[PDB]
Amino acid sequence: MTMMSGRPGRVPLQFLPNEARSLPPPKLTDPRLVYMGFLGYCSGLIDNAIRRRPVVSAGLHRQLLYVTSFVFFGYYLLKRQDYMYALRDHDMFAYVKSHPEDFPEKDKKTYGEILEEFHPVR
Amino acid sequence: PFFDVQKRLGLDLDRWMTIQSAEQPHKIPGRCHAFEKEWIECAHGIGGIRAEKECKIEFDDFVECLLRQKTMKRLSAIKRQRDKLIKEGKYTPPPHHLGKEDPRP
Amino acid sequence: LFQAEKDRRVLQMLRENLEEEAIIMKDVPDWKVGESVFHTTRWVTPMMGELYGLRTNEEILSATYGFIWYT
Amino acid sequence: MNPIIYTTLIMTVMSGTMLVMISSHWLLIWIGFEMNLLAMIPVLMKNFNPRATEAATKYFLTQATASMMLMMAIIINLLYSGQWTITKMFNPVAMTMMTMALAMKLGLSPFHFWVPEVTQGISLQAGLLLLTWQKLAPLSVLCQISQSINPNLMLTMAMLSILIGGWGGLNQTQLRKIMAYSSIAHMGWMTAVLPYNTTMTILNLLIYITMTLAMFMLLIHSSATTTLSLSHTWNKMPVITSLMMVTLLSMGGLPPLSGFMPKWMIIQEMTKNESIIMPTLMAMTALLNLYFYMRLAYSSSLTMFPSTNNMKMKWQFEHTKQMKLLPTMIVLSTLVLPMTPALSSLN
Amino acid sequence: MNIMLTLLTNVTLASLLVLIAFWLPQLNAYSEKTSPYECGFDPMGSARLPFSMKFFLVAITFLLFDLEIALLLPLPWASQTNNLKTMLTMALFLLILLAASLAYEWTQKGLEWAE
Amino acid sequence: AGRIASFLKNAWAKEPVLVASFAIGGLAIILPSLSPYTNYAIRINRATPYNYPVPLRDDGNMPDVPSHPQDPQGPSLEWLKNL
Amino acid sequence: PGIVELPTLEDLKVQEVKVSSSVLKAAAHHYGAQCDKPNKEFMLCRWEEKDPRRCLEEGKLVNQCALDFFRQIKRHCAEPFTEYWTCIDYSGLQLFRHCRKQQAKFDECVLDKLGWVRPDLGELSKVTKVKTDRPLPENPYHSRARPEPNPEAEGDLKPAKHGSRLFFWTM
Amino acid sequence: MTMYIAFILSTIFVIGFVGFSSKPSPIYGGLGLIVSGGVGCGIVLNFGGSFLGLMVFLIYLGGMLVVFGYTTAMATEMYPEVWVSNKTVFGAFVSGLMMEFCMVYYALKEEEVEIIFKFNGLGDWVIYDTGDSGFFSEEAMGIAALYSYGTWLVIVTGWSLLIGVVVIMEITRGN
Amino acid sequence: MPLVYMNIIMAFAIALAGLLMYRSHLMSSLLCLEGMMLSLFIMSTLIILNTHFTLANMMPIILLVFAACEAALGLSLLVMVSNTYGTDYVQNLNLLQC
């Protein structure tokens, strides 16, 4: 039930191992970052609405801080998520390579020589 | 769930007390120090799933040292046979097993 | 000197128990005399019951509760 | 209560939870639970009344029994193996005691009876704390020992928790009891997937905590604890009622809201393990939770209930104290579905 | 072994003294004689009625302060350790919190009996 | 200067017990850190042979290990005799 | 699981030391001074083999050296030694400090007849070196072969193919 | 086999537990718990735990004195109940006694797995260690290790005690 | 196992059942909690002494300390309940339902 917490050489509380630096960082115009900024903007608008302030124009510095904080956190969140998926793929490929007898390559037949059953529609 | 602050900081908040083979005061050993030492060194670094299978012999020895079930079973069988043999008079206990032994230092 | 005497006394008691066990457990069909209960072949410190299993109750009292009860 | 004393007690509760979090020794985990309960008991009684006293007494009795069972299980595990580390328990009987103890601490069925009464008997802040922070430690312990749990007992308790949460929430007019039954159902959902993937449990915990925090803060802002009292909020704070309605729809698990993602991920993860019947029953039963959420939304925001004359005086006053994190919690409770692949960061 | 015999002898002697006191003298028991005593008169209520305890808070504190003794009694053996600085630090730390706990209950009127 | 002097005078007039308790506690806290005999206490604790000293297998490269208890090598307790 | 091998009762016989604890305590300092080598060899064997069956000859040598020591004491002056150990034996704790005159007289007797010097405070508790021809045991724990570890983590980290690949998401 | 003293002490332990678990008046409950604490002290003494058994006896004596005071303050009735003054209490006491009797009988006369596992008996003397060395008590050394090895335990225990004092004062405030 | 282990385990079970089954007095249940703690202390001490695990000789002391904390908590709650109702009966604690 705990897949990758016990992976060897895993430092407890880094949130970003040094090996992650070999991966391309997400672009600053990543659509996920844009969505995080939109979430921050929505948080700012809801904050204005709750405090009975003009929703769109009241706090400009507060809305800017909201958007900036959301984007800042989302950048590192995306980095960690991409690194974790890279680890998953790396481990999967290494395990497949090291166990050829469990992932055999069987010759594939062409469809002219595979017999499929025909089910008429009527 | 389990944030290993101790391992990150190298603190040893409670790891000194987890096992019986770990630095007792005045070097007083546990009653099953060697069995646990063997079982720990067998299972180190191979993961919990493998430790159960490739180190079952060491764990069985450690558990036998801890609870001594098989030893008690053997002693009970021996004493039952001894009682059965005496009740019919076929076996007689030796003098050194009846309180008439010659003690040695 | 105490360690040497302890070793000799423990070994002698184990040997006497082994000989008496060989005499007693001859009729049992599939009983190996002196068969260990451990997979390991190294020396194991004898349990109290093993040393005094075939002896009188007074000796067992003296061995088990002799020091604790001594006041 | 002196504010310094209250701060010390809250910090002691949090430090006991963290002690449970960071410990490798079973005795230290037990100590963390004991410290958490000791500091938690006064917080339930901050506003003194017989109902608060009764709630604190019931809570103390339940948690003390659970702690006794916890220690007994630890002692059995030590007896059958000279181990103190929390890795995997070596005795099935000790593990059953451990599971029953942790389920009683969490309030899983059929140990659920204390949750609605204790939640009703305390204030909204104490209810928020009880239903959010008090779940972290037993869930962490269960996550650490996941490979040892018996799937039959755990899944039976989870299914019972979901069913009983739905049925009990169907009958409530008090908001605190509704939230308590919702909490029971969510705990059942969380513990259903624990034997298969602890990351799913952590994700469900985070989303449920976010939604529960948003809901409790919205209930504190509109100082109501009954359905009819909340029915008046439209005539004073319509925005609060609209946000409440959207959060209630999210709690029901409807797409494309956030509450749908934990159920979706749990169902797909369980289907990976050739488990089809139980997730189907789980969703079909969470339909009941959605039903009473919809009833609350009908009474609160989608229709307008009659009001009183004195509300005009309340119209002239603003809120003196403002909750800083309420806006963020609402957004995270509603609009985070597109960010699903981020769950890989949790493992 | 010896301590059990000593305890048995003491309990037996006390029980035998009770038996002698209860079977040797002449007994003339009647209802007036065996009635409850309140110096001239019949009691108004029962002696099993609730009796208020005005020092109830100090009684709870005694429970916590009694376990302080359990943590402090191994101190003579702890003075024989090599790392005397650590033991002294922890021993002084434990008593300081015991002194602070007494100071907290004293300053918050916890040692005064209920009125 | 004078404020604490008046406070201490008032405490000595009203609660001599608490004044004495605090003075003794403070002395017990601070004095051990300034004593030169604390190290002697640690060494005395270290010099007590509770268990048997297990001999080392000689390999010809231990010039500082005695081959007999009366050999000059090893620790000396001469400091303890004169203490 | 195997048969435990034990020495025969004949091999366990030795010329026993039949003096009481008071006599041993009275002689202990000079005994550890004179009979140091066989005792240290026996202890080295004992903590290296971890098996009493492998250090029987060393124990017999210990018995022989102790008997020689006590024979020398008996041959040269048994009367001061008898006085000293009687004084020691009276005490219920067998305290040295209650018998300093008898201990002294025994000390001059041994120093003049045999050139024996009582060890000073702090000497008998030293960790000493032992030269032996006994080979160092290779596997005193009778350990099995350790299981092979998991191979390793190695290689360059490349981005996951086609993103996370969770349902509809492209990243 | 040898005098089965610890067996008798543990049977009396169970008897006292049944006595205070059938729940008569708290006076008699505390009396039963005191008896159980004393016999448990004796049990622990018989295995070499002098300090631990004596300490638990002392602690439970203090606790039961406080409990007696509190029972007289707030847990009295006009007719306090004894083990034979009520059908429910007497039934619980008899049921506990006969359950213990059945467990003991089925335990020593044959070998059965009651709840966890099985056992034959043979007395407690069998599982001992016959270790022969030392000018100290290993229990005393292990307990004294709390001030050199268990710094973390001392910290958390002292904090919990201070917080407990604060907590009882907060709870008993009222208002 | 020794039969004393079964005796201590059954002591724990009996005390747990006594707590779980409630009569009128709240105080009786607190005594059952204390009995469970006592049985836990005895069992843990026996296990630690038998295996000669030196460092856990202090663990039962910590157990006793937190037992005292639990008992103080329970007594405080009983004080407040009895001040509210004049009696420590559990049937008075029924203001809150499910």
Ligand SMILES: CCCCCCCCCCCCCCCCCC(=O)OC[C@H](COP(=O)([O-])OCC(O)COP(=O)([O-])OC[C@@H](COC(=O)CCCCCCCCCCCCCCCCC)OC(=O)CCCCCCCCCCCCCCCCC)OC(=O)CCCCCCCCCCCCCCCCC
């Ligand atoms: C999927 C793809 C993307 C979709 C986007 C997601 C959906 C939308 C985004 C959601 C979050 C954004 C807004 C949240 C904060 C607003 C809160 C609010 O109340 O608004 C009041 C406010 C109007 O009030 P005001 O102007 O201050 O003065 C009037 C008085 O206040 C008078 O006001 P009043 O308060 O007195 O009126 C009382 C009223 C007050 O009640 C309300 O106002 C309702 C507010 C509910 C908050 C929404 C919940 C939180 C977000 C979750 C959304 C879930 C979406 C998923 C689908 C489920 C649908 C529910 O109560 C009622 O009348 C009872 C109504 C009950 C009926 C039930 C329906 C309510 C819930 C419906 C929610 C639908 C989603 C939000 C839609 C937009 C709402 C503004 O609205 C606004 O003016 C702001 C709206 C957005 C404007 C910003 C746009 C940027 C400008 C252009 C830049 C271009 C950008 C791109 C560049 C291109 C290059 C050129």
Ligand SMILES: CCCCCCCCCCCCCCCCC[C@@H](O)O[C@H](CO[C@H](O)CCCCCCCCCCCCCCC)COP(=O)(O)OCC[N+](C)(C)C
């Ligand atoms: C409703 C949406 C959920 C919101 C969640 C709360 C968001 C606010 C939290 C503030 C962010 C800081 C937290 C972590 C920063 C530093 C700590 C870091 O070191 O923790 C590491 C770990 O990193 C954190 O766990 C990642 C936290 C990221 C949470 C976001 C995932 C949400 C799921 C998808 C929804 C998208 C959310 C959008 C953002 C607003 C330690 O790794 P490890 O000790 O080995 O793991 C412990 C658990 N194990 C051992 C059992 C595996």
Ligand SMILES: CCCCCCCCCCCCCCCCC[C@@H](O)O[C@H](CO[C@H](O)CCCCCCCCCCCCCCC)COP(=O)(O)OCC[N+](C)(C)C
């Ligand atoms: C200091 C510590 C050491 C003390 C050592 C002495 C301990 C003494 C213990 C107490 C006993 C002595 C008390 C006084 C003498 C006993 C008298 C009485 O107790 O026994 C009578 C016993 O009577 C019985 O009820 C019936 C008598 C017949 C019983 C038959 C039993 C079998 C007898 C068979 C007859 C054939 C011989 C059999 C014996 C060999 C009942 O007396 P009762 O009148 O209420 O009490 C009034 C006491 N007065 C009169 C002295 C003031």
Ligand SMILES: CCCCCCCCCCCCCCCCC[C@@H](O)O[C@H](CO[C@H](O)CCCCCCCCCCCCCCC)COP(=O)(O)OCC[N+](C)(C)C
């Ligand atoms: C990161 C933030 C830090 C501050 C906040 C943390 C909150 C927790 C409270 C304190 C953290 C605990 C850390 C201390 C762990 C103890 C172990 C470590 O310190 O080493 C000890 C060093 O001893 C130190 O003196 C520790 C004592 C200092 C702590 C006492 C006072 C500080 C506590 C303050 C918070 C507690 C509650 C509030 C009280 C005011 C023992 O080392 P040593 O003995 O060489 O060797 C042991 C090995 N042997 C046995 C083989 C020999």
Ligand SMILES: CCCCCCCC/C=C\CCCCCCCC(=O)O[C@H](COC(=O)CCCCCCC/C=C/CCCCCCCC)COP(=O)(O)OCCN
């Ligand atoms: C750094 C040392 C710390 C450790 C050592 C101390 C160990 C034990 C001592 C502490 C025990 C706790 C004591 C708690 C004190 C409570 C104070 C209090 O509130 O009592 C006041 C009375 O006490 C006061 O006056 C308040 C504080 C007065 C000062 C007390 C001493 C402060 C420090 C003085 C000495 C400083 C150090 C010594 C230096 C000497 C100068 C050379 C109320 O009196 P009542 O009994 O209620 O009156 C009933 C009848 N009227």
